[PDB]
């Protein structure tokens, strides 16, 4: 079977053929007209029964008694005399002729289908989404008129209610009733425009025009949609999307649908509107020009439990306008206090021809409907209440259903409508039980509903008291919003093992992720012993700065719109942007370094650059507002961010525009110069004063008035010397001059013959490297406070520190061999322990020349070239691998052809690489190419096949010398162009690193540094740019920062609103409105001139 | 700092409770030193009816265009009673419409008596960020601080339920500013 | 079209098969070719994971 529609559903047929409601008919043909015009109660003439038994009722006699007593005439029903059977009509309508020939699923099923089977059909089979609202549109079932204004004024609003909520609209489907005008709303306003409306039409099958076409197993039945526009015929409206055509086994009688529609309303209102939201899907009724029975249908709702609100429209002067009339007459309680019944009874009969009797009984219904005037709503178009029927239909669920303030709020959340919640829920009158707004906040955060989170904070929600450890863990562990797949894998990486299957994320584990992502020596609060001794136990279970914690949450969960919102709220705004940049940057790197090929890394990199640019633009706001306070923002210790600074965080992210900003550079210049105040020509004034100490007194020094602000800060003769030598610019040149003297000596040592005992030059060289090594050990341990393992990893992340480490270790291996070698020989090169040591020195000196590139990179021009070279060498690997394969592809055949008598030796390795490598540089070995030529320098190599090798070398050089070298050059040219474009930015970032480096160094260079060591560690036993603010100036700085955040958004909005695109569009929208306003003059000007022609007489 | 919870980004406004007999220089120290306000180039003192009143729609957006420009093109301190029962309510209308400052601060102080302020209690506290319900019944005339002002000097005379403690301190402030060099 | 993420996700599932290493797969595979017991230390997809794989055969 494997077919749920066919297997489950049911079609009835009338098995039973009583005459047409009495004696068959007169007309002398008698038995003959019994074929022509004699039907059943079934609604079908004799040949339209067509049942297997009804055809045995076409041959001899019918299925009854001889004369068929009359309590069998009444005995026909659609319960006992109709046979259920699998269905026939279902598929997709093709409304051929209607505007792209719309499509709409359809099905023929009995009135007695169980309500759950219906729900299975709508949601499972048809793949419909469970809605967040159900609008049931009742109205007049007979072709009626509708004024042009109200037409386009209804179809703007009912559509928005079903489009802003995903509401199922419900109709009869057939165009004879209100469904025709629901279609008008759909045609105009381009009903969905990629934003589906589901409007089901539940109609009876026995009335459908062209019943036949739809018959067929899963058939695409087409359907004429252009019959006479006046002739009222039960023709399905071509703009609906779904049809449930209710069968009662009959033809030509309505009323089989009344239950199944209502049963569907019950069935949906007993479904959860959302996973967390514990309400039922709301239902509401809408009334467009109702007939008589529509009145009772209102009451039929107002009583039932739970009730159903009823929004009654106006216009057209029937049940719709009528209920609008009396709804203004009856009092607040619900009983007309005046004596004005015969006047409204008069009005009933002007709309419903009764005369007196049904008129009152029709009035008797309504006085009960006017009891429950809280579940009734009138949207009158004239004086324009509610501003919209959208909000009216929606607001009707909020008033009159005695719903808690919470239930009112959370339903707007499901719908994602703040405009209704702001205006209609948050208002004087609501009472708001103890923890309802907070539970609302949790739902809004979890569901990524930023607009409500905004609203809740404004309307009285404290994030300080809201945000707890349990609620924060519930936010990390949810799956009901935008998630980050990576986060689970980052937790699995920092938790070295695996996890039980239903592992719920812990904040300690988040803390370990944040430390991984921030790196260096960052330590999160969550990993600290205080928080642990709290957390293991679980005023203290709250957080002092919740908006810091939720920013981290939103970024780790890849919830960027929420992260941008939580950034602009709270304190520490520049830090939060810089932390966010680093977090996303590191996640981007993890994605890039994974084996997955996707767009996650470029997405996360973009998010990092978004917050990075916010931090730069905030720094420029602050700098233009107040330079001194801008510099304080760069330097204040961030207690909440591992005691770091915003400058250090920006450096951790390779955020060069922030570091290159003038404010940062001004800060760095003051550190570099110290108390020195030369504006020009400082390099040689410092050099000559290192070498001529009395020239120190001729230099310009800052006054204490100047050395007072310096927002990173921590004249007699003696203090001028102190000021000079403790200045980092001086420590640079003093270290530089000593380093150059070091190299000149060590160069002398390796070039000059080495004796038994080191020369005085060599001793000085040894002393330098030894004390330079002690310095490097101390730079690691007196580095940024952290774990020793973290300190180690950071310091070995620089190139020149790895090189210096190898340089230092190799030197003392070399010195040990050079110095501890016993001389069995007078020659001193017969001893090969000694020679090994000397050769290490000769290679070790390379490290020390290459370390001069780091000194030279202190210059603004040289520095970017040094970074170029590093990037060239670091990224050329794969081109060189290809070059090596090309080399061997030539080297191996050359050796094999030219030297065919070789036994295995390691000389084979040399010979296959050696000459081919030197060819890269243009050495062709001209007189070795053709070994059989007269001018050959290898005549003994002449032999069989040796004529091949010139052809091989011809190809090799073309590929190697021309193609491959110039590919490598092309790669290097791109590096040049990339770095040159950002050259000034590159040096300004380098400038941070060397100013910080020499700020922390001691005042003596590495030969004499030992005294600075030996004197300092006494003062600790015997007895960098970080501003330590008090809590009062800390609060002023936060106030400064929030002002500049406000000014940032203001300028952003002003720039946006001044842009030409924004001016074209507002003009566009505004000219459109005016074109109606002028037609509204062009319309009213008639009413003037024609009324003047009326008063002309 | 008030937190006018419920009003359109929940505006902020500094506040203080001080006696009617505070020396006029101490006031000037508060406005300029403590609150870091700039010495203005004008002072507009808005007086009017202290009882809820009506205002035609045209004149509404035709006043709030101009009083704002005068205080925005000059850096003028506007002065009111603060409480919405009086003219301060409509100074707020001028501020709401026309986006009062738009990155171009107006300083509108409201000098009110403390003994009439609705929800006196909330504001009590050393340097506290006291929030403040700004959505009471729109008709009911109750002495409720207007959520669009920036500063409040709530004049204490040791009482409850009587105005008239502010009449001097406001005028004394006017003297104190008019004896300051404009530049 | 071939460079689109959907195609690349499809191709990645084929390349790894029932293996499920996200990082450092090249040497985990090499060392496990050379040390077959290291095959057991590797991460494998569950059948729940090896169920959709819209090119799986
Ligand atoms: C034994 C001698 C031959 C090998 C050479 C050894 C010497 C050193 C040279 C090595 C060059 C090869 C480097 C790549 C392989 C290492 C791992 C790797 O990255 O694999 C990659 C595929 O790897 C391949 O496709 C390599 C195929 C083998 C090439 C063998 C010849 C190369 C040498 C030619 C002869 C001349 C030169 C040598 C002199 C004779 C896949 O890497 P991944 O990790 O999936 O991707 C990283 C990016 N991610 C983070 C986004 C995922
Ligand atoms: C922008 C740029 C700015 C400017 C930058 C400027 C940089 C300024 C840098 C400046 C200093 C440069 C000097 C270093 C090289 C000296 C070598 C030399 O000439 O040796 C000769 C001199 O005699 C001696 O050297 C004897 C002294 C032994 C110890 C060396 C100390 C030298 C001074 C350094 C003090 C420590 C400094 C370092 C501390 C770490 C010895 O050779 P000889 O006599 O021919 O040999 C005899 C041969 N025979 C055996 C055949 C007879
Ligand atoms: C974060 C920090 C970054 C920087 C790293 C910092 C750490 C840097 C660490 C550096 C040390 C690296 C290891 C060196 C090992 C020497 C090996 C060697 O040559 O052995 C030889 C000498 O062995 C001897 O013991 C005699 C030589 C004297 C000792 C000189 C080296 C130690 C000083 C180190 C000072 C380091 C200062 C560190 C200060 C902090 C053994 O062989 P032989 O005796 O020659 O054999 C003779 C045979 N024959 C007789 C047949 C001919
Ligand atoms: C790239 C494709 C080629 C094959 C690849 C496989 C590697 C092949 C590895 C080969 C090295 C292993 C074999 C050692 C045998 C040495 C014997 C000898 O004569 O030494 C000679 C030199 O050599 C030495 O003195 C010591 C070895 C240094 C060179 C090798 C370094 C490794 C290459 C680095 C890159 C790593 C390699 C890994 C792969 C890239 C000494 O003799 P001589 O200098 O002729 O003369 C001196 C004076 N005499 C005449 C008095 C003696
Ligand atoms: C005397 C004769 C005997 C000796 C002969 C020896 C032969 C020659 C041997 C070696 C040549 C010296 C260079 C070695 C490699 C450089 C590392 C590197 O790429 O760093 C770079 C990246 O990578 C890292 O920072 C980490 C990678 C290295 C791991 C740490 C060292 C571990 C021990 C050793 C294992 C590693 C390999 C070395 C082991 C041999 C750092 O770049 P950077 O500068 O940070 O750029 C930004 C600068 N900024 C922050 C200021 C903006
Ligand atoms: C990380 C630290 C690692 C290293 C720590 C230190 C380990 C200890 C290291 C060395 C100790 C060596 C002591 C002697 C060994 C026994 C042999 C012997 O005595 O004589 C032989 C020595 O032959 C040699 O080759 C000696 C030199 C070996 C060093 C090789 C480079 C390693 C260091 C590179 C830098 C690495 C650093 C990289 C930086 C990261 C021959 O000499 P002979 O006997 O006098 O002469 C007999 C021949 N004759 C008859 C012709 C005269
Ligand atoms: C005795 C002979 C004479 C001496 C030689 C001359 C002295 C040597 C000269 C220059 C040495 C290097 C200068 C360093 C400059 C600083 C760079 C830095 O900070 O970090 C850089 C690393 O930098 C490196 O990795 C350096 C190179 C490694 C050592 C190899 C040396 C060349 C030999 C092999 C060649 C021979 C091959 C053929 C062999 C047959 C970091 O840059 P990056 O990672 O690219 O940045 C990416 C940024 N991103 C994050 C946005 C992606
Ligand atoms: C897909 C195509 C397939 C190829 C089909 C064509 C097949 C080839 C067709 C023509 C090549 C020319 C003929 C060979 C040379 C003749 C000389 C001879 O016999 O002896 C020679 C060696 O002894 C030999 O037997 C050499 C045989 C060559 C092997 C095949 C080469 C293939 C070329 C690759 C094809 C690339 C095609 C082009 C691509 C751009 C020389 O001996 P001798 O030097 O006199 O002896 C020295 C004496 N002494 C020791 C006293 C000093
Ligand atoms: C290489 C050429 C020079 C040769 C000269 C002879 C050798 C003389 C060299 C060294 C011995 C004398 C230095 C003082 C002793 C160390 C005290 C110290 O470090 O700082 C002390 C104060 O700092 C000072 O008092 C300033 C000392 C540095 C300037 C010395 C200039 C002499 C060298 C160049 C000009 C000479 C002209 C000739 C050169 C052309 C205290 O320490 P701190 O730093 O404040 O803080 C550290 C922590 N602590 C406070 C807990 C301790
Ligand atoms: C080169 C180094 C290795 C030397 C080792 C000694 C030799 C061992 C090597 C080869 C002989 C053993 C192989 C099994 C016989 C063939 C069956 C087969 O192909 O697949 C069968 C099932 O698949 C398997 O049974 C998996 C076979 C692969 C695992 C073997 C790894 C051993 C080599 C590396 C690790 C060893 C450690 C040493 C290496 C460091 C069936 O075929 P199919 O593929 O499913 O489908 C084809 C169509 N069919 C189904 C209709 C039939
Ligand atoms: C992908 C690339 C393909 C090409 C290639 O790299 C990888 O493949 C490698 C294989 C290597 C050889 C293997 C074995 C030996 C025997 C040894 O014999 C002992 C010495 C003797 C002294 O007398 C004892 O007494 C001498 C060396 C030799 C011939 C190797 C040379 C280099 C070769 C050709 C390498 C070549 C560059
Ligand atoms: O580019 C800068 C432009 C202007 C200023 C600086 C800049 O950088 C600084 C820097 O760098 C120097 C290098 C050599 C000699 C003198 C300086 C200086 C000077 C200075 O100290 C200074 C002014 N103010 C303090 C003064 C109170 C305002 C702080 C910032 C400062
Ligand atoms: O880029 C991708 C991003 C996300 C995913 C994939 C991507 O590529 C695939 C790929 O590649 C890998 C390489 C190494 C280790 C694991 C994988 C994977 C994993 C995966 O299987 C996986 C999720 N889903 C199935 C799961 C039901 C969702 C299918 C697609 C898949």
Swiss-Prot record, chain B:
What is said about its interaction partners and assembly?
Homodimer. Homotetramer. Forms heteromers with TRPM6; heteromeric channels are functionally different from the homomeric channels. Interacts with PLCB1.
**Purpose of the protein:** Bifunctional protein that combines an ion channel with an intrinsic kinase domain, enabling it to modulate cellular functions either by conducting ions through the pore or by phosphorylating downstream proteins via its kinase domain. The channel is highly permeable to divalent cations, specifically calcium (Ca2+), magnesium (Mg2+) and zinc (Zn2+) and mediates their influx.
Family, similarity comment: In the C-terminal section; belongs to the protein kinase superfamily. Alpha-type protein kinase family. ALPK subfamily.
Organism for this UniProt entry:
Mus musculus (Mouse)
Q: Which residues carry this modification: Phosphoserine?
A: 8
The cellular location(s) given in this protein's UniProt record come to: Cell membrane; Cytoplasmic vesicle membrane
Name-wise, this protein is Transient receptor potential cation channel subfamily M member 7
Question: How is the polypeptide modified once translated?
Answer: Autophosphorylated; autophosphorylation regulates TRPM7 kinase activity towards its substrates. The C-terminal kinase domain can be cleaved from the channel segment in a cell-type-specific fashion. TRPM7 is cleaved by caspase-8, dissociating the kinase from the ion-conducting pore. The cleaved kinase fragments (M7CKs) can translocate to the cell nucleus and binds chromatin-remodeling complex proteins in a Zn(2+)-dependent manner to ultimately phosphorylate specific Ser/Thr residues of histones.
Expressed in which tissues? Found to be expressed in brain and skeletal muscle, with stronger signals in kidney, heart, liver and spleen.
Q: What happens when the gene is disrupted?
A: Inactivation of Trpm7 in mice results in early embryonic death (6.5-7.5 days). Mice die as a result of trophoblast defects and consequent failure of implantation. Tissue-specific null mutants shown defects in cardiac and renal morphogenesis, organismal Zn(2+), Mg(2+), and Ca(2+) homeostasis and thrombopoiesis.
From Swiss-Prot, chain C:
| Post-translational modification comment from the UniProt entry | Autophosphorylated; autophosphorylation regulates TRPM7 kinase activity towards its substrates. The C-terminal kinase domain can be cleaved from the channel segment in a cell-type-specific fashion. TRPM7 is cleaved by caspase-8, dissociating the kinase from the ion-conducting pore. The cleaved kinase fragments (M7CKs) can translocate to the cell nucleus and binds chromatin-remodeling complex proteins in a Zn(2+)-dependent manner to ultimately phosphorylate specific Ser/Thr residues of histones.
Lineage, top-rank taxon, reads Eukaryota
Quote the tissue specificity entry: Found to be expressed in brain and skeletal muscle, with stronger signals in kidney, heart, liver and spleen.
Loss of this gene results in the following: Inactivation of Trpm7 in mice results in early embryonic death (6.5-7.5 days). Mice die as a result of trophoblast defects and consequent failure of implantation. Tissue-specific null mutants shown defects in cardiac and renal morphogenesis, organismal Zn(2+), Mg(2+), and Ca(2+) homeostasis and thrombopoiesis.
The record's subcellular locations are: Cell membrane; Cytoplasmic vesicle membrane
Q: Which family does it belong to?
A: In the C-terminal section; belongs to the protein kinase superfamily. Alpha-type protein kinase family. ALPK subfamily.
Summarize the subunit comment.
Homodimer. Homotetramer. Forms heteromers with TRPM6; heteromeric channels are functionally different from the homomeric channels. Interacts with PLCB1.
According to its UniProt entry, the function of this protein is described as:
Bifunctional protein that combines an ion channel with an intrinsic kinase domain, enabling it to modulate cellular functions either by conducting ions through the pore or by phosphorylating downstream proteins via its kinase domain. The channel is highly permeable to divalent cations, specifically calcium (Ca2+), magnesium (Mg2+) and zinc (Zn2+) and mediates their influx.
What is the protein named? Transient receptor potential cation channel subfamily M member 7
What taxonomic ancestry is recorded?
Eukaryota, Metazoa, Chordata, Craniata, Vertebrata
**Which gene carries the instructions for this protein?**
Trpm7
**Part of the whole protein covered:** 733 to 789 of 1863
